[PDB]
Amino acid sequence: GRRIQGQRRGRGTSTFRAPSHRYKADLEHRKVEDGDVIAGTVVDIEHDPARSAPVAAVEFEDGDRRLILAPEGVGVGDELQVGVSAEIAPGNTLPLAEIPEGVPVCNVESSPGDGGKFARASGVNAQLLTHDRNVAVVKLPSGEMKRLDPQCRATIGVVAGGGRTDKPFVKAGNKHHKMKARGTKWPNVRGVAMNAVDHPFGGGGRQHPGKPKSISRNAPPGRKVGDIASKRTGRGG
RNA sequence: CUUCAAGGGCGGGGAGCCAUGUGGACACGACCCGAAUCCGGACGAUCUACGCAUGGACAAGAUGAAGCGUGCCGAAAGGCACGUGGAAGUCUGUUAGAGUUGGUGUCCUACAAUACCCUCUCGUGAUCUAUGUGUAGGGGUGAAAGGCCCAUCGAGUCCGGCA
RNA sequence: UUGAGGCGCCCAAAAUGAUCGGGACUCAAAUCCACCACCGAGACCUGUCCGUACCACUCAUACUGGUAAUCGAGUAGAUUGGCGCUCUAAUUGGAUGGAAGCAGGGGCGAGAGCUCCUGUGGACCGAUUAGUGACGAAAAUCCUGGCCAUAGUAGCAGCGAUAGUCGGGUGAGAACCCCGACGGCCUAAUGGAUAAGGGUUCCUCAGCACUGCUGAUCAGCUGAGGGUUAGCCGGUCCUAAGUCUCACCGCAACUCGACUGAGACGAAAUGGGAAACAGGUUAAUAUUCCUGUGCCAUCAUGCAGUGAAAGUUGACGCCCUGGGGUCGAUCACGCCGGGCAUCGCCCGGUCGAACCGUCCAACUCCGUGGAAGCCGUAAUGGCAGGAAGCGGACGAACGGCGGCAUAGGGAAACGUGAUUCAACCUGGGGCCCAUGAAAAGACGAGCAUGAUGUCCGUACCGAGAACCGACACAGGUGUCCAUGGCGGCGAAAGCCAAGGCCUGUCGGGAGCAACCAACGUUAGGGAAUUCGGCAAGUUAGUCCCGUACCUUCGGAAGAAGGGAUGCCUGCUCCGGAACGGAGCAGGUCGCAGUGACUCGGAAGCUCGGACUGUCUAGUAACAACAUAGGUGACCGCAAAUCCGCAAGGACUCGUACGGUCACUGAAUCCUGCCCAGUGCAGGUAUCUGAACACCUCGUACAAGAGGACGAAGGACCUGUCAACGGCGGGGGUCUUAAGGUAGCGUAGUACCUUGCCGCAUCAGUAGCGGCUUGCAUGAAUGGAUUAACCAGAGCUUCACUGUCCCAACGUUGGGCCCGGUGAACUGUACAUUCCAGUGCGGAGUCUGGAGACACCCAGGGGGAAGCGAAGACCCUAUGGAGCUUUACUGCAGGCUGUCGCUGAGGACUCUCACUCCGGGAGGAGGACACCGAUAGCCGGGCAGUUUGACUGGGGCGGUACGCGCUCGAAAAGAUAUCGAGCGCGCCCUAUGGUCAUCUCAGCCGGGGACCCGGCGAAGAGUGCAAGAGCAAAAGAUGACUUGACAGUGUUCUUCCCAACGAGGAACGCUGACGCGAAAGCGUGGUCUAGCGAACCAAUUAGCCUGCUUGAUGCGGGCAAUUGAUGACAGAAAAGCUACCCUAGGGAUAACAGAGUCGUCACUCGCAAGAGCACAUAUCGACCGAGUGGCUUGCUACCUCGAUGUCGGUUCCCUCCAUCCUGCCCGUGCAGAAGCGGGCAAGGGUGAGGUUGUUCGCCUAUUAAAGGAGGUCGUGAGCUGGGUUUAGACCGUCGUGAGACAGGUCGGCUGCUAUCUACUGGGUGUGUAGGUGUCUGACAAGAACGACCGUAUAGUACGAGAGGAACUACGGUUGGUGGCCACUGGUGUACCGGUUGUUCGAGAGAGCACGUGCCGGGUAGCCA
């Protein structure tokens, strides 16, 4: 047959690539040595084309104009502090050890000094729970208990732009516009609507899948379609 | 040679070797032409598909969302009337432009290897379009028709394998 | 009276024209019995010759003689002698006193071929012998070239751009080259400027051989010259998506490859960007040259300045909108010029840049001020955190103003104000799950003078002739002019300027016929047409009134329906005003006032998909795809998913409100039961589970055998269906888990089926509602439902109409004739055919007849199974390809163990490799992971293949695919079919072998066990089919025994004849045995079925052998046994294709023809039976005999290098088995009306509703509304609804691709007529200069068919009811021929009205598609 759509994806052609040249900033945490004497004023609130949520333009004490991942309730004029001895206020970045338990946090690092990996999408947050000399247990937006190094930096507050998922797209045109700003080929043609040559579920006199949809983990690319290694399917039971 | 034995098999009382012509066999293109393949290396996104960059295009009219206003009523929440406002993959539209339903009309050694006419659809948007740019052959591209990738596609084209 | 024979008669119906081959024949030219004489082959006889064979003579196969009654045809094929071509060689010749070749002619040879003569030609050419070979053509849809017919034919018409005409000029020549006039065409283009692309096409001169749809003096053609001028227009410079180079790394390697660095490249209309304007000039350039004026950058000098880099700019989305404002357009008035001349109106002009200077609205801000309700807007809005007002800072135009300018330009005047205002300037608002470039550069940052400003592009076209499309192609191809006038909402129509053009480039002629393309108008009827209103038409602009069901409250909706609409006079209202808008009163014209143009037909029910959107470039626009919405799955990021061999990469400037992978498909109400199978996932005592290492055996080592341990995986258990899917049969459970819940339901799913009832219609296989047992509905394989939307499928109503009844007339372009230009398709030959026949069964050519003087013109297409295409259907090939899967075999990939990297102290700690994070310090992880290697599991993701044969085509079924018997089988042997009957793939240690003893079925008689006797050739028994064999046995009993033995043959069979293996049998020998007294019997079972190659393994006994040699291990071999290939003389092996492809086949199916005639239709014989009695008025069984060739079936003869499929239509002919009509017979015939039958094919046999239908059902009419044949007549006539391509849906089936003799929506119709045929028209020839009139052999007709009514007559008849006829009349209908006084149509003759626009008004005209529209309409032509 012919390579399926998921295989054409990896080749990284124009149709599948993100419009990186139209993107603003790689929202990472600032590099401080030790001292905390790094603070800044918020100059503007901009729209980030990569995440459909707002991003705050901050100017630091040493004269560095950088775009930071904006939490909720951060405006122009507000002072934000980045460092170890930083104030426990919304919009400030300090390591998980210094942040008190039961406080909603965002833009959490995986390995200390990476710049933030977890809890970055609109309105989400990570919950800091347990403290130790060795480990800081953070509850990620999926409900998972992630055991992290207490030296991993994070910004206090929930991410801005909450409730985005609440309003429906209503029409295909609105989806079109959102998708033109992402690294995704859209619209989606069902495999069941294709020819046998194009997809494992293609073919037939009527539209139905060939074999069952739940595919093994060990399945090769070109066959791994439908429900990938499903523990279960359906709603009931 | 096989063989207690017996019986079988093959060979035996000197004709061959070489040359030339010719009959026939086998491998090779194998009397000659005749077809759909398969494989290799190359050349194509001047057509077309999808994406991207930078530009361009859309007479006129209709309908009248929110919001705002004034007035009346109400304790209030609000409600009603009128106006304002000018939303919309909104409507009419041969505006430009795009498309192509029917005539199974005209043409069918054509004007034309996909044309002509009338009719018909869309026309502020998932819109149309120029140029630049990207993706390449079991690979692209595909709102999926096995569509499209230069009159070539259920695996392009060229040459080679190859007689 | 009865029997028999001969010939004939009845029985006896078919489609273009009858037949014995024809004519025709009757005491025969028939038939039968005899007879006589003839004709008639290549046979037979005979003369001569030839070949071949043999004989004699001979060296001879050279002569000569002889023999053939017992030699003389031949495809495939075998054998043999010879002819011709090229060049070589030897020998030997010819030729300028004329070689070869060619043309015509003479002679020889059976022939291949040889040779001569004459003419031409003008330099080479032979013979014999031996060689050599790119050596012989009628053919291959053969190749290349040339050429004829086709043919003076098609095209040079068709397009909303119908274009020309009269004079004249030039010239050898003029319809189309030029001038004028008149008449037209183009208005987002047919005008103006350009991008690409072209490349000299540009200008001039000279030309016409080429090219130009005719011609040409012209030209984009031919030839020669000439032509493109830049500091300030582009390029150049900058950076965009992105590209390349180098370095690095990978790769076997590179011209290959991702990342990361650095560098460069990447924008000519249309991104950014230092600077130019006005005029003049050329045959051709021009912001480039020239004149005038101006501007920018750099550098130099001088003055100023020490500021200098922060900041600003470059620099930005979509929608709405205010303000400023120029060109343009228009209005007012004035000046200059022109036009018109009943008025006094109409047109043109009235100019003047860059630049320099200056002005500033908006925005923002400052001071003042002090609003508690005011300020403000088109709108939002603003404010004690300070509103209005006042003053001020900053600050715009491509704009105003002044200079520029006693510059330029104009014949002249050489204006002034205004409105609406593109450009340009500047603000306010709204939207985003969408956030709308970058860099160079500039500003910031003065002035003078001077210098420098190079390089590249620059012509022309930019398209119905300069580009792409082979073309001077009706196609395709980007940008700017979007503000010219009237018109109107308008960048709409229509008309007209500026500008362009008569080159969408052949003309002339005929009231100009048929026929065709586009089109106008048609009385009465009004969808009767058709699958279907396809096509056409209707409606229409604007205002007022008014507006249903339903609904998601948005909508439906312009629902529907009704009214109005012009001009003129005078006005009112809104607004600053418009040359803006809304109204009022009076007057007034037409058939018509959106007067043309522009411009919706409307309503209802049902199906589908929610909607906008997408798609098969080129037969599918749809119900298919997408969509929001719903849902499930995977993943915490060193992730999930995906790309790469690797180095590496996408997702990702991303992080679960994410994004990957799938399903469903808006909303609303909902979404039942099932985890048995399959899938996925989790778990797992126990079981199974590879390699490494480890242990045992083995080997001085090794191979090898075994054990222990045991990962993932599997077994097993569990979870899961919005996972694949399933939701039945039986009874008052069974399979296999459950057993169909809401709903919906004859469905796009229902076979039966046109289901039943209802609605609607005269009539409704349709449609809608209800019912509904559902062949075979049903819940995200989503069920139901649904407002809105739709070039989607079906149905109904109103309106409308040439779709129809039923056709007519007209208009334009063709067609026809003439000048010019000038193809192609097609061609074995012959060809004037027709009716029959025959033939490979579908003949212009054969046979028999008939007809036929030749040639030409026009026509519509009957035939040439017409032309076009090596059939796409079907089968076949040990063909191809795409696709599928639990086909065969493999390959990636994932998971998992093990080894290496890899280190220290059956679980654990550490840090030093290694990995990751961190800029770094350092942090996390860590001997793991990554990577290299190997092992097990999964593994259509990918690759290569296979998937047999037989067969009344193929498939399905079956196996006549290996064996045995009877019959078929025709009395030797052999013998086929999917022939008839039926078996074998073993079984038996005795059921084998021998010997002894003995005789069985069945029956009878005496005491179904047992006993005695008798009869009893065989019917018993003998393992199993069938046929056969057997009685002191081959059977039974008993006893003994293992010959069912080893070895090796002969022969037959397998395979008749007649080659072929395994297998089998008969018959021997050698050895050893058993039994018997012995002869003898035993090579399994009485005979014929019970069977298997090579390779490899195991096994039996002895021996041979392994690379210098000895020992040991382990191998190689001779002989044979066992293990299976049943497709049985042996491959290891599944499907789909409608996406298809190739080779072929009429070796083979579908349609049609042909044969047959069971079937079908029709008839006949007999006549049981009933018909109150009565066979025969009428009906009529059984049985028997036939005819036809409409149905069906059978066959496989014809065609697969194609004979176009159903139904319908249109037009022609025919048959009779007659439905009506005419004439008859019978009657259970009173009459009337019927029933049945006979002759008879002249004429007729019609309109409609459902359905694609044929068929059929139904309605109303009718004299009747018959059937059938003509390739199921008729696609070079039509239609295209059905069948039967490619798209899609539903049901059923399938794991799946996909399938269906199921349903459903969509889905293409080629060609210029050579021959023949006919309809009409001519020219010639024959009869044999003329005019006029006739004759009539033949030929055609349907020229007529039928009905109603009145008188007869309320009569005959009949109780009555009821109710005729002859005849004479009147009319109607169908058909036919002709004609136009009458009625009607047309009438782009003509006359009138009138809308828009242009010619100034008037008058009078053009255009609005070949009449703008409306009204009337003569002649003619018509019904």
Ligand SMILES: COC(=O)C[C@](O)(CCCC(C)(C)O)C(=O)O[C@@H]1C(OC)=C[C@]23CCCN2CCc2cc4c(cc2[C@H]13)OCO4
């Ligand atoms: C299955 O039906 C078809 O395949 C029709 C067609 O394909 C038509 C071809 C038309 C062309 C292309 C030749 O013009 C065809 O070749 O038909 C053959 C054909 O083509 C010449 C003619 C045949 C041959 C016998 C006569 N018959 C007439 C037409 C026909 C009709 C059929 C038929 C076969 C024939 C053949 O099956 C049933 O319907």
Ligand SMILES: [Cl-]
């Ligand atoms: Cl999304």
Ligand SMILES: [Cl-]
């Ligand atoms: Cl001879």
Ligand SMILES: [Cl-]
């Ligand atoms: Cl230029």
Ligand SMILES: [Cl-]
């Ligand atoms: Cl404003």
Ligand SMILES: [K+]
């Ligand atoms: K055929």
Ligand SMILES: [Mg+2]
């Ligand atoms: Mg970031």
Ligand SMILES: [Mg+2]
């Ligand atoms: Mg995109």
Ligand SMILES: [Mg+2]
């Ligand atoms: Mg989809």
Ligand SMILES: [Mg+2]
């Ligand atoms: Mg499909």
Ligand SMILES: [Mg+2]
């Ligand atoms: Mg398909």
Ligand SMILES: [Mg+2]
């Ligand atoms: Mg597949």
Ligand SMILES: [Mg+2]
């Ligand atoms: Mg479906």
Ligand SMILES: [Mg+2]
């Ligand atoms: Mg489905």
Ligand SMILES: [Mg+2]
């Ligand atoms: Mg292109």
Ligand SMILES: [Mg+2]
């Ligand atoms: Mg309003």
